[PDB]
Design a binder for these strands. Sequence first.
RNA 1: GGCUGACUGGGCCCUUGAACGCAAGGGGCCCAGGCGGGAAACCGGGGCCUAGAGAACGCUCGUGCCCCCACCAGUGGGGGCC
RNA 2: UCGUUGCGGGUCCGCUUACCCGCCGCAAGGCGGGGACAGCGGCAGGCGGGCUGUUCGGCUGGGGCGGCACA
RNA 3: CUCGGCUUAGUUUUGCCGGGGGAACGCGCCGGCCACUGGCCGGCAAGGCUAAGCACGUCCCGAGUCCGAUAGCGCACUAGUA
RNA 4: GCGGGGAAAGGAAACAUCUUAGUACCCGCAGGAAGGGAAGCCAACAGGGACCCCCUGAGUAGGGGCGACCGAAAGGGGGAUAGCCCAAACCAAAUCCUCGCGGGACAACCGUGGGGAGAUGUGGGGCUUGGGCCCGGGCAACCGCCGGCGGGCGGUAGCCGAA
Lengths: 184, 145, 155
Amino acid sequence: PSAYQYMAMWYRKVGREVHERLMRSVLIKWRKEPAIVRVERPFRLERARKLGYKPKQGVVVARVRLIRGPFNRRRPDSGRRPKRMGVYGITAWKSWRQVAEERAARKFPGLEVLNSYWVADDGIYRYFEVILIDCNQPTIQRDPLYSGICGREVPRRRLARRLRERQRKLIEHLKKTLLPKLKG
Amino acid sequence: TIDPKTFYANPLPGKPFYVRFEVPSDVAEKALEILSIARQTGKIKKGTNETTKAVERGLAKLVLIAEDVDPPEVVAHLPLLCEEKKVPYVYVPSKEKLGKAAGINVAAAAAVVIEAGQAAGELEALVNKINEIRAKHGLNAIPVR
Amino acid sequence: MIPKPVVQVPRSIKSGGVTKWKEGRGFSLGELKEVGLNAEQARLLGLPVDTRRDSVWPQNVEALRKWLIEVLEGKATPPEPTLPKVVKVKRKRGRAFRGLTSAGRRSRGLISTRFRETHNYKFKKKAKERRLKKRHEATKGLGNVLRISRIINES
RNA sequence: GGCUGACUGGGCCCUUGAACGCAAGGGGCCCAGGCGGGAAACCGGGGCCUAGAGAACGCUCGUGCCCCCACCAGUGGGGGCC
RNA sequence: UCGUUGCGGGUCCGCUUACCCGCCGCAAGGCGGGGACAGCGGCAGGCGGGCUGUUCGGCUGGGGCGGCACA
RNA sequence: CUCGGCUUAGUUUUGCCGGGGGAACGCGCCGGCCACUGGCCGGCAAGGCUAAGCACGUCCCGAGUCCGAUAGCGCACUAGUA
RNA sequence: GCGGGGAAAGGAAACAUCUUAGUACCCGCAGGAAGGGAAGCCAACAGGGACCCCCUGAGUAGGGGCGACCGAAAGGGGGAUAGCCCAAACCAAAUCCUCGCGGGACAACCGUGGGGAGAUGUGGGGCUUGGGCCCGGGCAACCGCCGGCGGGCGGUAGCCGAA
Ligand SMILES: [Mg+2]
Ligand SMILES: [Mg+2]
Ligand SMILES: [Mg+2]
Ligand SMILES: [Mg+2]
Ligand SMILES: [Mg+2]
Ligand SMILES: [Mg+2]
Ligand SMILES: [Mg+2]
Ligand SMILES: [Mg+2]
Ligand SMILES: [Mg+2]
Ligand SMILES: [Mg+2]
Ligand SMILES: [Mg+2]
Ligand SMILES: [Mg+2]
Ligand SMILES: [Mg+2]
Ligand SMILES: [Mg+2]
Ligand SMILES: [Mg+2]
Ligand SMILES: [Mg+2]
Ligand SMILES: [Mg+2]
Ligand SMILES: [Mg+2]
Ligand SMILES: [Mg+2]
Ligand SMILES: [Mg+2]
Ligand SMILES: [Mg+2]
Ligand SMILES: [Mg+2]
Ligand SMILES: [Mg+2]
Ligand SMILES: [Mg+2]
């Protein structure tokens, strides 16, 4: 049982009571800080590592604060049938997590968004942590996971030659070891 | 099994919530030196994941926890785990200084002594002082292993 | 000639016990172990392997054995291996803005249902049929014209 | 004086709707079940006759040893035909 | 009304850190007041031509009023 | 899970967004057209990538029972010009 | 092509639910295609076996002033075919980036030194034919990085071509 398993207990029922006391003091500073701020370390380390966070050069973790509730649906100012005139209760098909990802993407232009997770809620605001990666950094390009977003290419000669070489040697071995059993 | 709502009911002033008792500078500096002696002669572990596994497995003798972890939930589980397994522990003010005594170029949030080679006597005396501190703070004793 | 696996069409309740066969996705692992190969060796030789399939059919085994003898006796040329021969992964720009992150996938419904049953799929599919005037969209109200015509003629 | 036929399950015909398409409603003649009046014949499916009359969806009630509900069985619930 | 909403004490009293309001300060932060109320989000009832969409039948000695010659 | 809303064939049963509530852990969890119970069957969500085979026409090549200067693109021409 | 915001006219022989239509249009973001894609699947006790697109299933099931109208999926036939990784268990800095120099097909990489990241975990391992852990045997081990040298072919001007 890794330390990351114990880290999650503050967001489980066993540690929720102590954690909400911590958030009541941490949230005071966050409400005063800028709406989008870069952070040195993720607030939920175990959650961040699952979604692909690593402490490599070029990985950015940004904390995003935004107002909760349904989106600002606008009352139409022109003629509409009665079904299309309502306001209260109508929401967007986007969630605030995707909205928080897009806002973090704007502040770091050119960086790609990897993932994000929920952090905290208060009466007015919701807080997310967005993992963005620089696809131009050398230490990000060769990552086994980060090359899925930053692109990857292998020449066909590399895969075709080795697969051909494997098939030549497998057929040589199967003739001496599998052919007598098959014929028999 | 210990409820964190009771073990962390009364936090100390100007400290993260996982700190249970005040550690004087001379006891904290001593506990840093034993980690250096244990690394130099016997066997130690550094890093939160490695030190957590030691407490689970029962190979831990002293656990050092830094007070300056920025998200405190990275190491807040360690005191409850140590009290679960009856392993004595002590707080240290700086994770950068803990990492230096552990022999690594980076900070360590926590470290544990597995085998105190030439610090066997000093480790026992250190536990007595920290145990005396624990009694003053309404805490039961945790004896040397 | 590479042999093709022969699997059973799933016998439905509507069928009433009438059954037929079809070309399966690939040779099952149980069928391959009766000829001495695993999935890696079979794909290296060029056979199509389906590790998901659990059933074993003797007709599938015999076709494997006859073909394997010709290959190992140098009387047949095996095809290229049934493994990826190219790796092309493009750089992704604006994944968050095109709804391709986890939150966007959840909002689109790909976590909870299939792509064909998602709502954005249904919008695009019905638009293509109407644009091209395809099967049922070539006539609007085709069901109601059919229903009333059936009453009038089959009265 | 004695009763409840203002009955249960069905069919055919006339009129509404001329010859000539076409609701609902109304009337007539009967078959079966079970009754009432009467010695019996016979009559009774409201008022001596011609007016007082209402589709689809939905709901509700009655009825059936009734049918169905997604792999199988059961419980609650739902749907179906008249 | 649900949440924001917390800390003590015996539904009520109090407290301040939440929150809110103003003053000073680039900001950092300080001062004053209110105060777990308010304000804010969700849900629910009321008033609601402020605004949006519509309907305002037919016959008919022309239309309208009348009448129903509309079953 | 519940409430509001948009959407869906999804109907006491589609997906999602918002407000409030809110698990478990492989001895567990999920699905099998209302819910629950038992059996049986199939699986392992909430992390990422992936060629081929499919849309399009600024552009290039070819074809035509197409039009033939009031036709055919608005423009066969110092036309998106005057 | 992908995500979000989002009508009305008209239709229903009026009209409000509804349809029109998630359309017109708007905002944002990519590629030469995009998106989807590798079973918490479908089935029914018989079996299929990632995905997309085409034919069909089918105007069937179902939705709906059960009106107008709307409307699948599984399954079958085809085009094509391909499977993998991150995290965790276990080990604990064995790691990666940069630059100087020497070497090295101008490359990768090797040696050496400075700097940066990294115990809040770099790296190894692992990916349903679950894995980790322990034990024994065997190589046809396996998995990655560079694209130098040689050759062939095609495109971007042309040349010959009977009477
Ligand atoms: Mg309209
Ligand atoms: Mg249609
Ligand atoms: Mg009539
Ligand atoms: Mg007539
Ligand atoms: Mg009368
Ligand atoms: Mg009448
Ligand atoms: Mg079924
Ligand atoms: Mg209040
Ligand atoms: Mg209010
Ligand atoms: Mg008005
Ligand atoms: Mg009217
Ligand atoms: Mg008139
Ligand atoms: Mg009048
Ligand atoms: Mg002319
Ligand atoms: Mg012209
Ligand atoms: Mg039109
Ligand atoms: Mg109309
Ligand atoms: Mg009109
Ligand atoms: Mg652009
Ligand atoms: Mg593609
Ligand atoms: Mg793609
Ligand atoms: Mg539609
Ligand atoms: Mg690691
Ligand atoms: Mg010539």
